[PDB]
Design an enzyme around this catalytic site. Structure first.
Site, PDB file in Angstrom:
ATOM      1  N   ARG A   1       0.862  -1.200   0.000  1.00  0.00           N
ATOM      2  CA  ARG A   1       0.000   0.000   0.000  1.00  0.00           C
ATOM      3  C   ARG A   1       0.892   1.242   0.000  1.00  0.00           C
ATOM      4  NH1 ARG A   1      -3.787   0.886   5.189  1.00  0.00           N
ATOM      5  NH2 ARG A   1      -1.860   1.826   6.011  1.00  0.00           N
TER       6      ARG A   1
ATOM      7  N   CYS B   1      -0.167   5.524   0.736  1.00  0.00           N
ATOM      8  CA  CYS B   1      -1.210   6.479   1.096  1.00  0.00           C
ATOM      9  C   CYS B   1      -0.584   7.878   1.147  1.00  0.00           C
ATOM     10  CB  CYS B   1      -1.890   6.043   2.383  1.00  0.00           C
ATOM     11  SG  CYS B   1      -3.181   7.194   2.906  1.00  0.00           S
TER      12      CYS B   1
END
Ligand SMILES: [O][Cl-]
Ligand code: NA
Lengths: 125, 124, 125
Positions: B101, B103
């Protein structure tokens, strides 16, 4: 089919994500931010931060069975496009012989108010 | 190359598709918190995050994938102070399976939403 | 892994390449609206979008791919108010083929351009 990469050599991916995955002979890293293994920001200095991110990524790649010379694509998310030359100088030390594809954009804000965050897509081996 | 466009979601209007499938990998579009009427569900960031992941689950399914096959997620957000609230909802969808991930807080999102998420996922 | 650098386009400055090709996929660098002299073609966001997509058309050809092979586009923009105008140009390049796309407004782009686009594409045949 899919491998999930997590190394205690690095600051933990807290909660619902991992350091990297490996699918179909490709590594997908998480964005690395300039934490040491104690989970602290290493320096206020943008070049020190870029080096810690790239040192972190070298370890992710090692653990995923890749290396910097196998990187297809990097994305550099930065806090200040005015720091770009300083960041690029350090990046060029890690990507000298191998020069992968790249995008660099200034975001509004990064986790923990860090100055630079880099994610990689890399080939196995 | 397979183009994915499911009638279980509001149509991708203009020059894009819900996803593509190439070499046993699903590339989703960035989902934003539209309900099936194509209206922004709510200003609430946890509702928006849930709507986004519900939308992406339907895309993965119609592409022959599922959330347990996700390699990589990118989460674009309006406000990093909302990160913990976004993460709580995110971890309900990626509970046992925890993919890669990134972000970041962007300046602005389509239709002034608070989150947009795109996925890269393996065909089952 | 193949490295792609085309003389048709302004040189990648320092430690990046125009694209890589690995396991049947092209990863492009994010293209900004520079002409072959490496000048920003225009202040107009539709001229900038056109130059970006003309630059990506040539990278894809040199990589042995094409616009109808694109899997995924990421469109970084400076101003969400420009989105309708950018989309109008983008739909001229992506009419027969509609890839997956993400579009976000960043704080800042290299050389204060208004638009930057990266692509993930399949090798042609
Ligand atoms: O996040 Cl290592
Ligand atoms: Na990190």
């Amino acid at each position: 089919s899919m491998k999930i990469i997590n190394t205690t050599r690095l600051p933990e991916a807290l909660g619902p994500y991992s350091h990297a995955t490996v699918v179909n002979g490709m590594v997908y890293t998480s964005g690395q931010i300039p934490l040491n293994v104690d989970g602290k920001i290493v320096s206020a200095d943008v070049q020190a931060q870029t080096k810690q991110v790239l040192e972190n990524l070298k370890v992710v790649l090692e653990e995923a069975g890749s290396d910097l010379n196998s990187v297809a694509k990097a994305t550099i998310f930065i806090k200040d496009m005015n720091d770009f030359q300083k960041i690029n100088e350090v990046y060029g030390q890690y990507f000298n012989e191998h020069k992968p594809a790249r995008s660099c954009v200034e975001v509004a804000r990064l986790p923990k108010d860090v100055k630079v965050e880099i994610e990689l897509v890399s080939k196995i081996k």
